[PDB]
Amino acid sequence: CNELPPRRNTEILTGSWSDQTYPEGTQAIYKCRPGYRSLGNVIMVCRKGEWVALNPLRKCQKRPCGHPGDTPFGTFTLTGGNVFEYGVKAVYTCNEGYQLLGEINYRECDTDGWTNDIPICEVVKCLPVTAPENGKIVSSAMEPDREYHFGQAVRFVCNSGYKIEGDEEMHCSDDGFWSKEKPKCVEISCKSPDVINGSPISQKIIYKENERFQYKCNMGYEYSERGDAVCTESGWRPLPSCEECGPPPPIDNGDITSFPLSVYAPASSVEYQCQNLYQLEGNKRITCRNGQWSEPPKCLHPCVISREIMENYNIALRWTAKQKLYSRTGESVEFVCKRGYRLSSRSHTLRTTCWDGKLEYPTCAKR
Amino acid sequence: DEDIIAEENIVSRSEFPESWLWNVEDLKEPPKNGISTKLMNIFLKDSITTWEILAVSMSDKKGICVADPFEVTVMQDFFIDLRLPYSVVRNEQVEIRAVLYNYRQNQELKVRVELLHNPAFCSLATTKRRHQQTVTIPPKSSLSVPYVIVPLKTGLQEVEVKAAVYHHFISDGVRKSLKVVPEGIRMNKTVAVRTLDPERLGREGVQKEDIPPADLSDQVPDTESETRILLQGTPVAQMTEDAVDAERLKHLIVTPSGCGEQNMIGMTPTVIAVHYLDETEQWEKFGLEKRQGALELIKKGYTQQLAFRQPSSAFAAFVKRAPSTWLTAYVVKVFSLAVNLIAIDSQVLCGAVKWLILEKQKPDGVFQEDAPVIHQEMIGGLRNNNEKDMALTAFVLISLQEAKDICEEQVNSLPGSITKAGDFLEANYMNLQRSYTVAIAGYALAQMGRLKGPLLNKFLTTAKDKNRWEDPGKQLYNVEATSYALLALLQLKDFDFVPPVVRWLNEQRYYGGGYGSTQATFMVFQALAQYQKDAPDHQELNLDVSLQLPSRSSKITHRIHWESASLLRSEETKENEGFTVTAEGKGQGTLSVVTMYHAKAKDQLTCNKFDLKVTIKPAPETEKRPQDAKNTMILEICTRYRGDQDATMSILDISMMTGFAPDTDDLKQLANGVDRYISKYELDKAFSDRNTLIIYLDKVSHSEDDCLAFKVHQYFNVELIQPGAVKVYAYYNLEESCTRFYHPEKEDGKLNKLCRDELCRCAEENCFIQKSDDKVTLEERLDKACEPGVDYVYKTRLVKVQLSNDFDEYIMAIEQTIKSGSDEVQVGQQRTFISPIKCREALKLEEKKHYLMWGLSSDFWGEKPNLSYIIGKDTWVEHWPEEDECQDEENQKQCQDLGAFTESMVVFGCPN
Amino acid sequence: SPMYSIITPNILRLESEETMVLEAHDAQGDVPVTVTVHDFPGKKLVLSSEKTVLTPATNHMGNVTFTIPANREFKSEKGRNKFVTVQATFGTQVVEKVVLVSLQSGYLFIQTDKTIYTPGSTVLYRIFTVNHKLLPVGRTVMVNIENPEGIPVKQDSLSSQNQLGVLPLSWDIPELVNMGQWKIRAYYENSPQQVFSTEFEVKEYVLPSFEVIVEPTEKFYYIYNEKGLEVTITARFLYGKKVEGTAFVIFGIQDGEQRISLPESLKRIPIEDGSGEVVLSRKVLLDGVQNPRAEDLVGKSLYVSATVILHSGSDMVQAERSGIPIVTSPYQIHFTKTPKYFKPGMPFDLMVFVTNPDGSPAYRVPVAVQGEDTVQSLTQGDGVAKLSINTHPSQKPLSITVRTKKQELSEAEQATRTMQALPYSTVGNSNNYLHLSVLRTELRPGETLNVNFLLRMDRAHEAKIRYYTYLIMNKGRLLKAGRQVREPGQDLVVLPLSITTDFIPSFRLVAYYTLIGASGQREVVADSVWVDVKDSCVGSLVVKSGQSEDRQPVPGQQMTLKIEGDHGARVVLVAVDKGVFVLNKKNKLTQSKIWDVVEKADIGCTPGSGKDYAGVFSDAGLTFTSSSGQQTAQRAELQCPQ
Numbered sequence A: 001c002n003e004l005p006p007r008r009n010t011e012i013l014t015g016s017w018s019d020q021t022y023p024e025g026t027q028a029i030y031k032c033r034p035g036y037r038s039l040g041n042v043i044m045v046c047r048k049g050e051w052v053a054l055n056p057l058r059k060c061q062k063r064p065c066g067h068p069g070d071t072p073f074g075t076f077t078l079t080g081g082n083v084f085e086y087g088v089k090a091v092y093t094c095n096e097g098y099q100l101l102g103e104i105n106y107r108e109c110d111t112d113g114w115t116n117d118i119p120i121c122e123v124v125k126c127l128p129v130t131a132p133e134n135g136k137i138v139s140s141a142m143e144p145d146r147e148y149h150f151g152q153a154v155r156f157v158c159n160s161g162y163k164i165e166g167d168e169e170m171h172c173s174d175d176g177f178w179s180k181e182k183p184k185c186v187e188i189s190c191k192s193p194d195v196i197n198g199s200p201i202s203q204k205i206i207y208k209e210n211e212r213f214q215y216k217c218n219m220g221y222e223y224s225e226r227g228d229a230v231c232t233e234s235g236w237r238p239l240p241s242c243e244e245c246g247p248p249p250p251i252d253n254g255d256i257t258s259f260p261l262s263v264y265a266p267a268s269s270v271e272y273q274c275q276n277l278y279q280l281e282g283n284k285r286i287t288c289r290n291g292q293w294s295e296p297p298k299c300l301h302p303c304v305i306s307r308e309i310m311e312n313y314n315i316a317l318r319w320t321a322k323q324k325l326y327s328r329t330g331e332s333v334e335f336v337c338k339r340g341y342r343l344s345s346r347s348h349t350l351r352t353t354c355w356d357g358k359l360e361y362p363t364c365a366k367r
Numbered sequence B: 001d002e003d004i005i006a007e008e009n010i011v012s013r014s015e016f017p018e019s020w021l022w023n024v025e026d027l028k029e030p031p032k033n034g035i036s037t038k039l040m041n042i043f044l045k046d047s048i049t050t051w052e053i054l055a056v057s058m059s060d061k062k063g064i065c066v067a068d069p070f071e072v073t074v075m076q077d078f079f080i081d082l083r084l085p086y087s088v089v090r091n092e093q094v095e096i097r098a099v100l101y102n103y104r105q106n107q108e109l110k111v112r113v114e115l116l117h118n119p120a121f122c123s124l125a126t127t128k129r130r131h132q133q134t135v136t137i138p139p140k141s142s143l144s145v146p147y148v149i150v151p152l153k154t155g156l157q158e159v160e161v162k163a164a165v166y167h168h169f170i171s172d173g174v175r176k177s178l179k180v181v182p183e184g185i186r187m188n189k190t191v192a193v194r195t196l197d198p199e200r201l202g203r204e205g206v207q208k209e210d211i212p213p214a215d216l217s218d219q220v221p222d223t224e225s226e227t228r229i230l231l232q233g234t235p236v237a238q239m240t241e242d243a244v245d246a247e248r249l250k251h252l253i254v255t256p257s258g259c260g261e262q263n264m265i266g267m268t269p270t271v272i273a274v275h276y277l278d279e280t281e282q283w284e285k286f287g288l289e290k291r292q293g294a295l296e297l298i299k300k301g302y303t304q305q306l307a308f309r310q311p312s313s314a315f316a317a318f319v320k321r322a323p324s325t326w327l328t329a330y331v332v333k334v335f336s337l338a339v340n341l342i343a344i345d346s347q348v349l350c351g352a353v354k355w356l357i358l359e360k361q362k363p364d365g366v367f368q369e370d371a372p373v374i375h376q377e378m379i380g381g382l383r384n385n386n387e388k389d390m391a392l393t394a395f396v397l398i399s400l401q402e403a404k405d406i407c408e409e410q411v412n413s414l415p416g417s418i419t420k421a422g423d424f425l426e427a428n429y430m431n432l433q434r435s436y437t438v439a440i441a442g443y444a445l446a447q448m449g450r451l452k453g454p455l456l457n458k459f460l461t462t463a464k465d466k467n468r469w470e471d472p473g474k475q476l477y478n479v480e481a482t483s484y485a486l487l488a489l490l491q492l493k494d495f496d497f498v499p500p501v502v503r504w505l506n507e508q509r510y511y512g513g514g515y516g517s518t519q520a521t522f523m524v525f526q527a528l529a530q531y532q533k534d535a536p537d538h539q540e541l542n543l544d545v546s547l548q549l550p551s552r553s554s555k556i557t558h559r560i561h562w563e564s565a566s567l568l569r570s571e572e573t574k575e576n577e578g579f580t581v582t583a584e585g586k587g588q589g590t591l592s593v594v595t596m597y598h599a600k601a602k603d604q605l606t607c608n609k610f611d612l613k614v615t616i617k618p619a620p621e622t623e624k625r626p627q628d629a630k631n632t633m634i635l636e637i638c639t640r641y642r643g644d645q646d647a648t649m650s651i652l653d654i655s656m657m658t659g660f661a662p663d664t665d666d667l668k669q670l671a672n673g674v675d676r677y678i679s680k681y682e683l684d685k686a687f688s689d690r691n692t693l694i695i696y697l698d699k700v701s702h703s704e705d706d707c708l709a710f711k712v713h714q715y716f717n718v719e720l721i722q723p724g725a726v727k728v729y730a731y732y733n734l735e736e737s738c739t740r741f742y743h744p745e746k747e748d749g750k751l752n753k754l755c756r757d758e759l760c761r762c763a764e765e766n767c768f769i770q771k772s773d774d775k776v777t778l779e780e781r782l783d784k785a786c787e788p789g790v791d792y793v794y795k796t797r798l799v800k801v802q803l804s805n806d807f808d809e810y811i812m813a814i815e816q817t818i819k820s821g822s823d824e825v826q827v828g829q830q831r832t833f834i835s836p837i838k839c840r841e842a843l844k845l846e847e848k849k850h851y852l853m854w855g856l857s858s859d860f861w862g863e864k865p866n867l868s869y870i871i872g873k874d875t876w877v878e879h880w881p882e883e884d885e886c887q888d889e890e891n892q893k894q895c896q897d898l899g900a901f902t903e904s905m906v907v908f909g910c911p912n
Numbered sequence C: 001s002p003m004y005s006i007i008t009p010n011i012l013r014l015e016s017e018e019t020m021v022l023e024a025h026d027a028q029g030d031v032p033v034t035v036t037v038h039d040f041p042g043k044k045l046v047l048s049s050e051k052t053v054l055t056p057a058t059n060h061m062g063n064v065t066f067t068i069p070a071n072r073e074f075k076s077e078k079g080r081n082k083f084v085t086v087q088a089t090f091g092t093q094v095v096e097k098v099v100l101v102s103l104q105s106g107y108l109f110i111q112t113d114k115t116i117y118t119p120g121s122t123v124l125y126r127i128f129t130v131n132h133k134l135l136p137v138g139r140t141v142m143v144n145i146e147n148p149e150g151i152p153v154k155q156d157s158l159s160s161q162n163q164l165g166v167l168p169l170s171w172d173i174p175e176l177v178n179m180g181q182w183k184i185r186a187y188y189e190n191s192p193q194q195v196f197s198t199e200f201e202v203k204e205y206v207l208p209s210f211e212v213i214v215e216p217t218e219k220f221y222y223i224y225n226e227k228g229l230e231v232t233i234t235a236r237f238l239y240g241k242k243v244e245g246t247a248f249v250i251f252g253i254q255d256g257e258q259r260i261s262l263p264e265s266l267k268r269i270p271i272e273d274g275s276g277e278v279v280l281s282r283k284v285l286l287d288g289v290q291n292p293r294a295e296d297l298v299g300k301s302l303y304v305s306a307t308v309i310l311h312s313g314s315d316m317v318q319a320e321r322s323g324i325p326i327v328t329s330p331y332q333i334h335f336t337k338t339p340k341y342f343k344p345g346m347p348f349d350l351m352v353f354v355t356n357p358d359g360s361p362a363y364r365v366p367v368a369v370q371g372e373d374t375v376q377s378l379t380q381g382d383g384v385a386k387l388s389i390n391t392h393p394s395q396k397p398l399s400i401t402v403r404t405k406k407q408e409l410s411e412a413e414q415a416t417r418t419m420q421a422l423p424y425s426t427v428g429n430s431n432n433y434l435h436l437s438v439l440r441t442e443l444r445p446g447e448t449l450n451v452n453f454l455l456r457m458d459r460a461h462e463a464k465i466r467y468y469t470y471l472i473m474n475k476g477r478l479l480k481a482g483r484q485v486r487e488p489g490q491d492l493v494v495l496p497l498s499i500t501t502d503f504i505p506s507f508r509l510v511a512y513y514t515l516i517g518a519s520g521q522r523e524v525v526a527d528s529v530w531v532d533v534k535d536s537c538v539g540s541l542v543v544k545s546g547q548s549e550d551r552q553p554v555p556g557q558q559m560t561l562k563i564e565g566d567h568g569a570r571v572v573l574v575a576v577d578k579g580v581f582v583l584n585k586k587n588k589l590t591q592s593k594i595w596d597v598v599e600k601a602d603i604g605c606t607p608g609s610g611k612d613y614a615g616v617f618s619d620a621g622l623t624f625t626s627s628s629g630q631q632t633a634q635r636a637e638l639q640c641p642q
């Protein structure tokens, strides 16, 4: 032959090859280029006037890379082929809820082996959550402010006297953010109920916890089981149901003789009554004149005569009915010195009159 | 090599998962007759077996469906089955088997199999030479290739075997891992068991437990241990007293009838019964349907009581009778406790309250009964004339505070009146004598929070035996009094005094009903119903337990809560340390410190149930040109069962030495009767590729050794002959077995290794550095002995040769220190050079002769008092001619080179 | 004259859609109905409130569908049962009933990737979250990992939302771990009393290279069979090819928990082409036990142990086959499918359930009643035969004895069982009975079953019966309710019931009629029957080859998998080596086990009928309550009675 053996596409030369023309029978050994495999060396031979192939069957095939290996919480797919040969690319993808750590997501079968390392999938994580004001976190699993991961659910429960405001439960969602917003704990409060076929008895509109709401039913309707509602963190339990000038001012030691109502309008009137033995001063009936109530009366204070105070003054009741005696405003009480006592220096009378809770006790200073 | 795939181009199979393909796919394709087909591409693993694929679908409209298993077998024509045990013991010589399978129909295969070298193992495979064998596997057949290895270091180590066939493009590789385990036996010691209770056993609310480090006296050298700190919570149910049985209340359901007083006497048991069964939730045993009628009766009683409501919003036994204070107050009481059951009119309740304040309350503040009730048995403890003012005030006051939340909006004088009543009870509370009055006034004042100081003290000291407020008279008065006191203790939150009171009440077995039970029926069930309400279901558990290890930078904390009290909280530490545990909070727990380690074993580790002796001897006589082959030896195997009786059917698993095969005639003679059996499959196999053998025994004696023997011929020749092995066991248990090795040279078939304590190094490398002294120059000697690796270069004289059964010792005198390293040996001192017996003939070291020896620092073996040298693969050993020998012309080259070597090393040394 | 009646399931479940049927018999015009559900006994909350109108065009029969929210209030002090008050109001009349409540939110199914695991590996498991209709739902589930001792070692609280009812989780097994049966325990957050479990064994092992199957010729051993117990040993590699070797077989007798090995029965046989045979002779069996009376061995079982060794001697596999009953009869008769109450004078139907000693159904087995050779039926594919007898009008207890009449079998080996049925007590001894009969045949979705309503009563009020009210119970909830028009004079009417996929696995049909008869008393007569349906998936899911069958896979080779299932369905997969199953094949998730859990959570407790008309409703999981006062007793048992 009058040349060198042609440089094949998948083979390489091994000899020096410095001469120009080569005699007959010379064997040209072709080495298997990197990333290829064969049973032996592919040998070429020059005869007549061309470089023939002594081993037509022996050929260099693509080198087999091993199984690229599966990573936890992730699958892979093959690119540019269907066999683990030299020149393919195994692209990895993490499962739902798992994010890739690093920047290399492929493995390329090269002449030496699989390029880079097997990718690693980490579970996405949500920011830690703090306990809301006037509330706690009953759920989760221990550890104050530990980073939650995909899936874990969190529940919120307020303390006593507070009700929740917002979504009750949540969970670490797919994008590493919580599924719902952080709620709030507001003091338990209730509005005035709109009772159907009824009218409210009470005056107050805003209610706190465990406060009861009294109501009456319109004519033709009656109470459905219960006759009142209670303010709870969930609302009015049970719910009110009927099935088929302002209030007068308060006075000390007394009330009105009728059930109070909400509005009176001009020309209305109410009567007052004092507690037992208390004495009333003023007009016993008040009247609404031009959106204002007339002057309500007052209850004068009666005097209580205790044996404890009479013993200190060495005095006793003349007509012994106890040990204790009450005297209304204006009533007079007659005392006598105990046996062996005299009217004392700072006394003048044994008969004194009670005036709005003030009674002058006589003293006896022992003769 | 010709016509075979090179070793470096074979990628061994390594993916052998027991389970895989844990994937999720959705069927989104356009349905065809309701079925949507999805073609899914999968990558098979390296295992050669059958996979069972199970499918489960979840549809919005169809639900869950578990498909039938779909089996997919994966196979090859030619493959390696590398049979590895789960674990092996460090430094113990074991044999593994690689079984080569050829499943081609009509093509035999010439195969070359190689065991890759691994520094963590000891085998004939080294870094320098390979371990190959060329076998022929007939079609539709298999062949077993034994490899003998010795695990050197613990942990997850790797075994890799490759194979390639001649004249074909067919290769396979297997790379598996096994666990190497310390020699000792798995042990654990219970270091500490401590009870955690900060509120009970701790100082200032914190409890510190000091844990001592574990004993670890019998710990196997060079083995690790793990100490576990196990925290758990102790949940404690707090013993709520048992509620009164529902059957014992069947009689309290009474139809109310009569007049102003007889109606309330019949209404009392029913109202309080529903109130109790409602709270204790016992309508299940009583009868759910019955509760409806029970309500109608309460309504009935209420409606009938409205008929006696005088226009003054008061109440009396009869419409003409003067209004009674106590009766009106009691109607308020009952009606206030029944608002949660039926429809109670506010005007009725609040009107009665406004009446009592304005008409029967004096200035001082005390209630007066101006018309005593006609039934004096419905008032209970108030009959006892003493301290009527204090008692009646307390009664009426309690009815007011119970109807506060309902009649505080309508009645405006209520708070002031409650306050006035409270003043009188406060002022003359300490001058009480009757236990009953102290009890009823105590609950009237505890509702306001005005029962403190000496008053609270008198309330507590008036209770005889700390569990009952008892006063001479009827027992019903005492039951009422103790009920009031229990309601007061439930108001004062004094749960330390409540259990004794409640227990005494339940022991009375008083279920209400009867002549004059009114007060005693209402009060005892109101107090018990409130007791089951305030009763708190479990003792609070909230433990904060913080560990403190010296080897940890921060603090490991654990929050033991009630909802997760039983969760075992484990924290592991590899160092055997003493540490401090600090617990704080309410509740109880348990701490268990348990340290796992490796303990030396007195008891025999191998051959516990069988004795096995294996001998290999040169066979005598020998004939001429028949037989089977040349070089013949005799294998003798003697076994005895270590039991009380004979062993049953047993197995002899014999692996040949590389190049040997049993004699057919001897096997046919053993197989005939004599309680032995060798299958025809074995007897039919040719002389070639019969390197494994199984002799079946019908029984083996326990009294003495049962011995057999047969001749083995060498058909193949190899430079390195691998030891064969024999493994005896009983058919019913493979674990209780014994394995012995045989090698004609090497006694006890063991490979060459140097062991001390528990660290063994391989000694199956080249005997020394063999080269051809002509090819060696002065530069060659200078370049090698100047390498940084070479630690010592000595001119020595062999003083004495101590021959031993395992390793030969060469006592050398350091004549000259050409280069010194770690060992600071002086001229004149002696050092011992150790070497394997296989090398004794190859070294030919004679006494009174001299040698140039240099070696690595890795060839040291001992401790400074007895520091010895190992003649390894990198140990230069050249004979040094004597001065009279250097005058000769044959030794001229070596003498000139050696003299120059010494001079250059001494004067110039290594350039660097 | 108008009578108002409500029917609601015996037990009401939370977060599940429950139906309530409303009827206004003998009424005219439109009847406004408002149904409210309150808690018991406080009536604190209105759990539901729906409205409807009963018009004559709908025969004064309507339904109200409601779902009760799982409030955190319905959680007691633990232990007591929770109840609700169901209150239906028609015009002036109000009818209320107290119904038991179950806390069960639905079902949880756990699937572990394997059945046994080595220390160090990770356990991958999925939790399927459905409701009582097996439809995927989104709720919060609590998971607990538990060691063999019982101590929980890992808690968690996750959500099933946006997961299509499948929740993939994992737990790492430490290297140092306690061997034995571990458990996973999950429960819905709302229902902590219903805890679903799956076990997985932890053990040190290696996968075998072949499988050994020990299968006796018969599934039992006849005590007087002189041949003895003949056993076939089948060994084959995990990749299909057969096994050549030697097998050591040994027999033993098991009595309860006492095992007695038989040393004399040990045999060594050649395994040629993967198969061998070894017989335990009757003589050796009798000599091993120290009792000459062979009759005493009946009731005990046999176990077989076989050890196979390859010719290479590199692998060994031990396998066992236990639980082989020593019996005197090849069959076993069960009355677990036949109602235990009859209607005097009417034909009584029996559902005989014949099984093999191992519990499997027996196909084509002749059964007959003693003294009535004419009443001889044949078992179906499920081993269920139908036997109809004729009852005389009487109050005497009907005692039935069924025997097998398999020809070619002696009378000493024929199986026998004895049952008893009680008379259906009638309202005021009026002798008014109703009898429902159904063609006994494996029923499949997509067919039609003819339900025969047969009436028996005096002619003084037979014309008054103008319609029947029929109800269907499936999966423990009311599936369908309707009317069956009956003309005066007709004794038998036929109901064409269309069977769809919503009836799997079985349903109860309970029908009743009401009238004013005899002494002007309001009377209700009822009757129920249980019908089995072919257990299967609602849809379908098949996995097959997505390539040419001739092509065998190769280690590492890409392959195509053809998956054909329901449109839109999310399918979860797993590939497991069959070697794993050779060591442990328990707790494997199948479809038969799903329907097993469903059928075990049923609120019905009887095959059919009851002692009275109230017993019929209660035993079929229903509560009836009329305005006139005829109502069923309360139910305070979540679980059926013994």
Ligand SMILES: *[C@@H]1O[C@H](CO)[C@@H](O[C@@H]2O[C@H](CO)[C@@H](O)[C@H](O)[C@H]2NC(C)=O)[C@H](O)[C@H]1NC(C)=O
Residues within 6 Å of the ligand: B186, B187, B188
């Ligand atoms: C480690 O601690 C355990 C405590 O759980 C000890 O108990 C052993 O465990 C086996 C269970 O296989 C029990 O039957 C015995 O109580 C113990 N067996 C032995 C051989 O001691 C034991 O000290 C350690 N566990 C093991 C498996 O050795």
